[model samples]
Target: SNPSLVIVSPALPGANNGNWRTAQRWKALLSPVCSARVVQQWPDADASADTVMLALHARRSAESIAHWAHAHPGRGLGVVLTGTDLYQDIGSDPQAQRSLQLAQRLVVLQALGAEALPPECRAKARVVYQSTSARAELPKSARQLRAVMVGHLRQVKSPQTLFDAARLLCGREDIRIDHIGDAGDAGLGELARALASDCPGYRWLGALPHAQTRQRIQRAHVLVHTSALEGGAHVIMEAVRSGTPVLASRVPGNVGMLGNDYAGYFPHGDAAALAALLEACRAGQGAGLLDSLRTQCALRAPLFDPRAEQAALFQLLNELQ
Candidate 1:
């Protein structure tokens, strides 16, 4: 009998943030498979029917991974490890470790993730880059070089770094940085308030709807991703496809998405370094920075094209047979 493929994610149906949305996008891309299903809760999932399950966030979905593996002992299971799962949880957590042991295969969004896993688990994991949609029209620009940052004001995202970078450019008048997303953390909100009080060059636009967020990315000269960690960022893809450059943190997930050869990176969490780099980018003094970024991103754009992702998903599923 042919085996059916299923994708299990703690990310709920229609959830619109990064991880859930990525999971949904994967589900949509796998449409040709016809046998795949994505479920929010694991306990009620029909484990007996699925031959292969792609579980998002290995530890977060540990119970479901274990549940499905236990239900179908000889069946195939593939776990997609998320940011926190690979960097934070996989090290000492028993549930995460158990999930790794239960899987026949594993998926990592970035290059460094496989290295973070146990040697035995490393051999089973493959890199599956998450992708984002692009805009048809690029935003028109004025004299002011506009830079946008997406992601909530939270510790994991290190939203403060954006503002702190803005402060580093306090006196620069040519570049304008727009900080988007809600203050998801009280500390970040306080920092936002502080930046608002002092830095006029930066604006904390706060949270915007999905369409508006995409608009910001489309209009910006460059998109900034200042995260401590990421499980591959959709915004990076959006920036790439919209013809906007990215100023990303040099984390494994980011490096994996932007590529190791990309030049617009700042050391993770180093606000001053980020600010200097951003200031140079804005000044057009970064030595072909935007053009170079655009060219570099162009090479990876096809990998994120909707059709490309669909093809990749189908290829992965075909391997299940």
Candidate 2:
């Protein structure tokens, strides 16, 4: 008999976020090995042959985690930790802590993420870097430097940094900033609109469809990631896979995804430093820095390959089963 599995994610289809994408992709990867289905939440009254449960977001999916552990004791139940789980929730929330305790296996998206867990929890934890299909670099402008930041208007994403940097570089006509994401947070949305009006070179496009966003990443000279936290940003991988270099905030999640030696980082929330780096990446001496960043990102590209992610995910499932 084919063993069945369920992947629970809090993000629904219309959300168009990372968690939803990961859940759907895992369903594809695990289909041949086992019958897998992705759902926003487990049914309260449902019958299935599902023998394993893989949940994304420890806190948000806490109920499902508790349910699966209670209903199928000693069966495979794993939790994928997100930025909030590691950096915020688990540190204080009881439900989040319990989810950690209940999970048989813990999955983190980047290598250094394992370090954030308690020593005992680390034993069951594994890093499964997310994947994206590679795209050849698209032609970009030589006369003007174009940088794009893709993320929702939320505090955790730290969209404020990009806004501040845009303000800092308002006078630099040759440098353009394109920000793509929904106004998830009202305050930040207002701030973004204000910046777009005041900062002539900066434009906030709101949220674009995923295909258009990927194409935007491919065509840009660089992708900027200013998130205060991340569970291995899919956008970073998307950009790197598309041959667009990244300028990231120096946080554990970013450092974990991009190796420590990567020269494309600025201090977290330091808009001045980010603006300086953007200036350096434009031309002259900064051109070399941009090239080096691209080369370093290229070296790390294979780590995000779909084949590698599938192998790691399959190994995790095998261990769970």
Candidate 3:
């Protein structure tokens, strides 16, 4: 018998970002096996035959979780922790803690995220890494080493780190830094514009369509990620799957996704370290550094495979049963 399930997501299709896409993908993955649907909220004072419910954020979905628990009691209710939920809100927020207490299952998008949960709550936590279809790395140019950062210009994203790194690498003709996200912050936009004017090798392409952005990842020699916080980033998986190595900030989410042994980590928010990694990738002085990182990333690619993700989703469904 097919169980009817509901996914409560705070960010809807209009948001058209990572969390929304995750909801959509989950619905598709479960559609053939169960009656699954996605919504912004529970949309009822009382539950409507939804045997199981999954909410995407601990804090944002607290109300929906409260409603589900009220109607279904101790039955199936899954709470997923996002970057903000795990790193920022879960420790201190009343609503987030309540959601954790009420959840029959806790879903985290990365392996290390479970460490952030309270000891009692950690038993219920499950890691579910996101996936993207693979793309063969393109034959990139030999004239220069191209590095791209596909992230928004916001504080938590640490766009300023990359901007400062761009400034640091301005004199290196062989190192090209192209940033591809629109400024979510006004001052950050101004900073990007200023750097674009001053840095000969840095270009702020702004926000490009998803297809274009992925193509940039495919073409680049390496993808740079500088986030102060992340639950699990889709861009990191995208880069690995495309056979492009990464130069990431040393953060739990990045380490979890890329594995502890990954060779290309710079200290979070440190422009000099990030610039040094980029410098190593260029000027031929890197010797075999880029290729070594590429080999290391290739070994982790299977972890991000679309098939692997689907299998894990099925296992998650089994956990609900």
Return the TM-score for each candidate structure.
0.91, 0.97, 0.95
Model 1: lowest-lDDT 10 consecutive positions? 279-288
Pairs that clash in candidate 3:
none
User: Which TM-score value belongs to model 3?
Assistant: 0.95
Task: Please list the C-alpha lDDT of all candidates, in the order they appear.
Answer: 0.79, 0.89, 0.86
Candidate number achieving the greatest lDDT relative to the actual structure? 2
Q: Which stretches of model 2 miss by more than 4 angstroms?
A: 44-47, 285-287
Local error of candidate 1 at 236, Å? 0.8
Among residues 3 or more apart in sequence or in different chains, the pairs in candidate 1 whose N, CA or C atoms overlap within 3 Å are none
Looking at model 2, residue 136 earns an lDDT score of: 99
TM-score of model 1 vs. true structure: 0.91
Badly placed stretches (over 4 Å) of model 3 are: 44-47, 285-287
Q: lDDT of model 2 at residue 37?
A: 84
Q: Write the per-residue lDDT of candidate 3 for residues 180-271, one digit (tens) a residue.
A: 88778769988999899999799999888889988999999999999998989989999999999999999998998999988999999999
Per-residue CA lDDT of model 1 for 1-321, tens digit only, reads: 555667777865665577677677887877666576778656463756676777888788898888878876745677888888888888899999898898877888756778778898887787777767777647445467788998877788988788878888888787888888887776787788778778788888877887898888988888999998888788888888888889998988888888889988999988988887776665663245777787888887766777766776676666554
RMSD of each: 2.3, 1.3, 1.8
**172-218: candidate 2 lDDT, tens digit per residue:** 99999999999997688889999999988999999999999999999
lDDT preference between candidates 2 and 3, better one: 2
